[PDB]
Design a protein around this ligand. Sequence first.
Ligand SMILES: [Cl-]
Ligand code: NA
Length: 382
Amino acid sequence: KGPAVGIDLGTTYSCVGVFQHGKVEIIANDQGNRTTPSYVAFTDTERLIGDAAKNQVAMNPTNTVFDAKRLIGRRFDDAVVQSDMKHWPFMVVNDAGRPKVQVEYKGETKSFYPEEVSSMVLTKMKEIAEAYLGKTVTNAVVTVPAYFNDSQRQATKDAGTIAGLNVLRIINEPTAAAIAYGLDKKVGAERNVLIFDLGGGTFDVSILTIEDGIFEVKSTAGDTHLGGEDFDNRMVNHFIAEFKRKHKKDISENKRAVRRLRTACERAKRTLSSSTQASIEIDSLYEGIDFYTSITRARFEELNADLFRGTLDPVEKALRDAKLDKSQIHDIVLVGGSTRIPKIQKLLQDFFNGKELNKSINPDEAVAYGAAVQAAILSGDK
Ligand SMILES: [Cl-]
Ligand code: NA
């Protein structure tokens, strides 16, 4: 048993960390990326996992699988499954009451339970950890949403087992983020912690109470279908209209063109969290026509103004459910790359009358960070 690792198995991307020599190290994958898309794809000749999968989605949409976390621990008949499957290009089928994703792989029809798909992502995370450490990785803490039920938790454990991991503990994502910031190292009176978690595809607000290192989930709120991708999409539509003006062509039905634009918009979003201008640079976007343009932070904000303001409604609901006034929150913790958005941070701070945010740990890494901390404690290394 080498060091144990912490794995954030995310809806759209995943992240693995390890506690070593008094520090957490977030581990870059085989593409040099500190997060890995929760994607798997199948071609005539192979199975792709992570960046390779994500990067060929437009070329191979029916055999590229994502959002397995939406299915994990579910039954086919579930209202969530029935609704969600309407917006996936891959097939979901009923196996005796349990959903399976069905794809073509090497010209053959194959199908996989959600935890089998997730097991492939966990295998990727294990492998990148092993490549970094230069030794075997067996023990892990794996995180899940606080709202996950017993079935969802057990299926997640099953994904780990399938990947050859000994899952030391299933830990809640907000709890992991709080552990990252050492909020359970505070000694004294009860403390109320709000986690504001805006991922690629979901938005979670959680309120925890911590006392003597002991966590209680007081309330959860959010929107399981709101995330950074929504903000990217607003930019995408903006640029489709721009291309139409400038080049008198509508790229809307070309999946490859839209995908390359989407990728550019995602990059632009990140850029705009640190600078006031970002470029869109796409050689041969459509019919050989180049698209080189740019956008300001202000314009990005305007395009998304309603969605940004809308993030405070779940914050209000969570406080209501927890029977807490906004003034009773001791700590606000930011999780998810979109929480880097200055306008979001400003909206949140303004809501909390100027209170400062816990944001020094990369918000896309905070969950894996806390998972890594707890893995080291549980394995007897911290
Ligand atoms: Cl995600
Ligand atoms: Na997340």
